RNA sequence: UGCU
């Protein structure tokens, strides 16, 4: 609860990373795309959607771990 | 660049999240600025200002 | 891959029943095509399992009547194997306790057979 | 049988996210130890139930969901005095080959024990008189892979009587 | 022969600079790929004559 | 019936401890002696010499004639190494300031 | 290889390994550098943390603590080349987790 | 040309071209234009899902002379590749499996 | 450090290998465990 | 730190190509100095015997 | 020069000089035969403290039977620090 | 040896 409430540049690609992969895994989709064929075009509609089902964990350097969900934090 | 015939390289990943990675980091409307003083390299050039 | 303790716990052959047959029936319930042919060899040892469980006289058991078998036993001083195995055998006769029973030297006494008999027989 | 304490990565691919977490780390679990001897610790015949499960990552390679799941199950492991009941699935000269029912073909009782009239003369024959009753003594465990079975235990049947088969 | 089909139509048959024997009739991939040297890695292989290495 | 072993798991490299083996670690470590100073054979199809150099129990080099060790082509052979005994003990130079 | 000639391919200098780490496309350094040029999978002993072969570990003569793991095959000539040096790289490794 | 400065901070990759410029304002910034016979030879894994089976069936139905199109395929059961040159396009790609 | 890692081929420390990820699936930690009716 | 027996590594590390063109075969520097080694151990143990 | 060895020398050499045969006397009879007590009493002595056995399977009846028992020396504390009492 |  002490970080930025903001979603950084690289958490918005690590997620759409895997979220693609993930879909090219044939995983399930939660937006009902409409003639998508990529696979991160798929994952940014999810972003943009906030339907990912992904949390962040964030790790403090001393050790300590936070949560945060895709649909909390804030996109840009 | 100057199109003197100057021989540019182009790479095409081979796995989704590099894929991502490329395009949200290494996207040329993200990196519009550069970080050394924040001044915008990607502008007009010769043939367009004039 | 490692275990932490082999021997936790020891159970009855009812416990490994009552599991045998919720997997049965959830098997039967939500059999999945794919996930039957990866690994073939689970489906062949709970049958086989629960059919050898099902040739012993196993059946007719209920957590009530085990738990009051238990508490009658106790009183008994006998030890966890040999309640255990008792349990698992559920002996008709005596001779199955007189001999077949380990531990039979000072622990039959002549009298506590049967009330042994009656208490695995009720 | 008795209960076992284990600790699992478990690999869960992308498209069974669908599916229950539990109930995907329960199946996976059961066709991993299916079947299977675990060294020192015997045959498992099936999960037994979950204990605790905590977060499950995702790597940055496969790009499946890894989870390191800690569960109880059931295996096959006498006590070293346990007595079973099983069937004579053959014979041989130097002992008899009795088997568990329909559950596993390792038992080889050793015929060093009995009243002295013990001989097999490879036409299955059992015993002289004067369902089989089995006393376990002793497991034995050994490995597979050496370059580039692991079950038998002891088995016993001392002078028990029998008055119902000789 | 062919792994899949068993065929024993198998050509070698260069595609965009990747050495490969294939079959000619499923197009099933043999073997790919070949380790050649490279150019200073040419170089530092140093030339001994057979008079010398034989013995 | 059949033992449980795990097929394959997701090692990853914690650090690297560098150190020293004694010549009893590398005789164990070595699978052939190589004694021969010649290379190849004196029949005509130049056959490397066994327990000599260039001999294909310690790996191999060509697509041909595969590892002798292991039996696997060049692209799934890893190598193996060998120890040479020294008549005389010698300073090692990248060891003698220490 | 190196020429065009000999059908070689371009190199991602140190230059542009600078690039890519400035950028932090940690996933794609990786893909580039490890994955689509030198990729390979080695066989490691847990125990004496030796390299074996075919799931083999020749120094202890055993096999239960051999486990596979991706490793550049450049990475993998250097450790060969500091064990020829005598130093020799004692890889303990450990679960992902 | 060492292993550290040579073969591992900086080494050679697959999957890539070198080629001339040359000035061309109807592209936006975000994009750049790859020549057909470049783009003929650098593919891309595409893994067949719920999705894009249709367009996969397509590019192998092309096959690796027209332009849109793939050059080989890889089982899932099986890892042996097999070239779209050879063999009959429309069978392979009519037993298109997922993954 | 990120040369170690470059060198030994894993992802660096920095950039977005500096979090981990965790899947948001359905589940119910710590599960209800089955009695045991002889212990 | 005193070294008596010499690692020589496999023949990954040292590539040998075939020249068939003639007769002979393109060899690293590492294969020549074990061969010098080996003919020195060779010439001391005769020159002790 | 010298000449090419095919096959690498034996593992074990031989020699033409064999070791010199043990001294005998009975001094050297009975240092051997007390040597030999002693490693056969010694083992047995409460300072041989053995591997303490643990994971026992079952309790039964029989283990008063079955319990090892062994007379336990008690250190000297006075002499002995503070940080080695049990 | 040329190229940027
Ligand atoms: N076409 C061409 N010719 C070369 C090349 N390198 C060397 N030469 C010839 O060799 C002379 C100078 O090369 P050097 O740089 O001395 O060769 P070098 O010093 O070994 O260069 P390195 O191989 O990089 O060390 C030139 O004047 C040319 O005669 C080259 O790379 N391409
Ligand atoms: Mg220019
Ligand atoms: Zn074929
Ligand atoms: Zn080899
Ligand atoms: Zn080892």
Request: net charge negative.
């Amino acid at each position: 609860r002490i970080t930025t409430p903001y979603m950084t540049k690289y958490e918005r690609a690590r997620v759409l990373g895997t979220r693609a992969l993930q879909i090219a895994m044939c995983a399930p989709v939660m937006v009902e795309l409409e003639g998508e064929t990529d696979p991160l075009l798929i994952a940014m509609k999810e972003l943009k959607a906030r339907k990912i089902p992904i949390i962040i964990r964030r790790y403090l350097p001393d050790g300590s771990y936070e949560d945060w969900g895709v649909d909390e934090l804030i996109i840009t | 660049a100057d199109f003197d015939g100057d021989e540019m390289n182009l790479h095409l990943p081979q796995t989704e999240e590099a894929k991502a990675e490329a395009l949200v980091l290494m996207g040329t409307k993200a990196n519009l600025v550069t970080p050394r003083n924040g001044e915008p390299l990607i502008a007009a050039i010769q043939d367009f200002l004039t | 891959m490692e275990v932490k303790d082999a021997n936790s716990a020891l159970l009855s052959n009812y416990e490994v029943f009552q599991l045998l047959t919720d997997l049965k029936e959830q098997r039967k319930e939500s059999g999945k095509n794919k996930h039957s042919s990866g690994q073939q060899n689970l489906n062949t040892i709970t049958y086989e399992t629960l059919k050898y469980i099902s040739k012993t006289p196993c059946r007719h058991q209920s957590p009530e009547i085990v738990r009051e078998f238990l508490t009658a036993l106790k009183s008994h001083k006998l030890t966890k194997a040999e309640k255990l195995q008792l349990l698992n055998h559920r002996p008709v006769t005596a001779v199955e306790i007189q001999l077949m029973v380990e531990e039979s030297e000072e622990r039959l006494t002549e009298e506590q057979i049967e009330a042994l008999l009656h208490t695995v027989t009720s | 049988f008795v209960l076992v304490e284990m600790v699992d990565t478990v690999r869960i691919p992308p498209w069974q996210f669908e599916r229950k977490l539990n109930d995907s780390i329960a199946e996976e679990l059961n066709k991993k130890l299916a079947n299977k001897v675990v060294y020192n610790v015997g045959l498992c015949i099936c999960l037994f139930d979950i204990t605790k499960l905590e977060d499950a990552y995702v790597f940055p390679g496969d790009g499946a969901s890894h989870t390191k799941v800690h569960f109880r199950c059931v295996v096959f492991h006498p006590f070293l005095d346990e007595i079973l009941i099983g069937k004579i699935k053959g014979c041989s000269p130097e002992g008899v080959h009795v088997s568990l029912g329909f559950f596993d073909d390792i038992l080889i009782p050793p015929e060093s024990l009995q009243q002295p009239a013990k001989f097999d003369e490879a036409e299955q024959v059992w015993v002289w008189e004067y369902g089989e009753e089995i006393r376990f003594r002793v497991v034995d465990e050994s490995f597979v892979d050496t370059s580039p079975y692991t079950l038998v235990g002891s088995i016993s049947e001392p002078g028990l009587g029998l008055l119902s088969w000789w | 022969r062919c792994p899949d089909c068993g065929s024993t139509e198998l050509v070698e048959d260069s595609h965009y600079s990747q050495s490969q024997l294939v079959c000619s009739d499923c197009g099933c991939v043999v073997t790919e790929g070949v380790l050649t040297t490279t150019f200073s890695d040419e170089g530092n292989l140093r030339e001994v004559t057979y008079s010398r290495s034989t013995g | 019936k059949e033992q449980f072993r795990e097929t394959d798991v997701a090692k990853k490299i914690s650090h690297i401890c560098f150190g020293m083996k004694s010549p009893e670690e590398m005789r164990q470590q070595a699978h052939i002696q190589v004694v021969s100073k010649n290379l190849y054979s004196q029949d005509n199809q130049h056959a490397p010499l066994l327990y000599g150099v260039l001999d294909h129990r310690m790996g191999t080099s060509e697509k041909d004639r595969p590892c002798e060790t292991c039996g696997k082509n060049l692209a799934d052979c890893l190598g193996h190494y060998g120890y040479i005994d020294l008549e005389l003990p010698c300073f090692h130079v990248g060891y003698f300031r220490a | 290889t190196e020429g065009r000639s000999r059908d070689g391919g371009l190199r991602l200098g140190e230059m542009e390994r600078d690039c890519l780490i400035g950028y932090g496309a940690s996933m794609l350094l990786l893909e580039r550098l490890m994955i689509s040029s030198d990729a390979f999978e080695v066989d490691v002993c847990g125990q004496c943390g030796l390299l074996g072969y075919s799931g083999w570990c020749h120094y202890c003569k055993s096999s239960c603590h051999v486990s596979s793991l991706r490793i550049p095959y450049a990475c993998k000539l250097l450790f060969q080349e500091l064990q020829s040096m005598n130093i020799i790289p004692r890889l303990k490794l450990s679960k992902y987790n | 040309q060492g292993r550290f400065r040579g073969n591992l901070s900086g080494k050679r990759v697959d999957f890539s071209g070198r080629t001339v410029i040359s000035p061309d304002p109807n592209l936006r910034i975000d994009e750049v234009a790859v020549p057909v016979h470049v783009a003929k030879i650098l593919t891309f894994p595409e893994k067949v899902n719920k999705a894009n089976i249709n367009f996969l069936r397509k590019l192998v139905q092309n096959g690796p002379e027209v332009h849109p199109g793939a050059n080989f395929i890889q089982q899932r059961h099986t890892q042996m590749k097999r070239f779209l040159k050879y063999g009959n396009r429309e069978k392979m790609a009519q037993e298109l499996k997922y993954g | 450090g990120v040369s170690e890692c470059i060198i030994m081929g894993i992802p660096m420390n920095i950039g977005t290998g500096l979090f981990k990820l965790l899947h948001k699936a359905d589940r119910d930690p710590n599960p209800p465990k089955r009695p045991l009716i002889f212990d | 730190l005193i070294l008596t027996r010499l690692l020589v590594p496999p023949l990954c590390i040292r590539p040998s190509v075939v020249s068939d063109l003639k007769s002979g075969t393109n060899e690293d520097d590492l294969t020549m100095k074990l061969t010098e080694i080996i003919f020195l151990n060779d010439v001391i143990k005769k020159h002790r015997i | 020069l010298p000449d090419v060895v095919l096959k690498p020398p034996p593992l074990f050499p031989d020699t033409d000089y064999k070791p010199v045969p043990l001294k005998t006397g009975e001094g050297e009879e009975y240092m051997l035969a007390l040597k030999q007590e002693l490693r056969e009493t010694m083992k047995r002595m409460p300072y041989f403290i053995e591997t303490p056995e643990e994971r026992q399977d079952i309790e039964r009846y029989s283990k008063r039977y079955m319990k090892v028992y062994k007379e336990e020396w008690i250190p000297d504390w006075r002499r002995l620090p503070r940080e080695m009492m049990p």
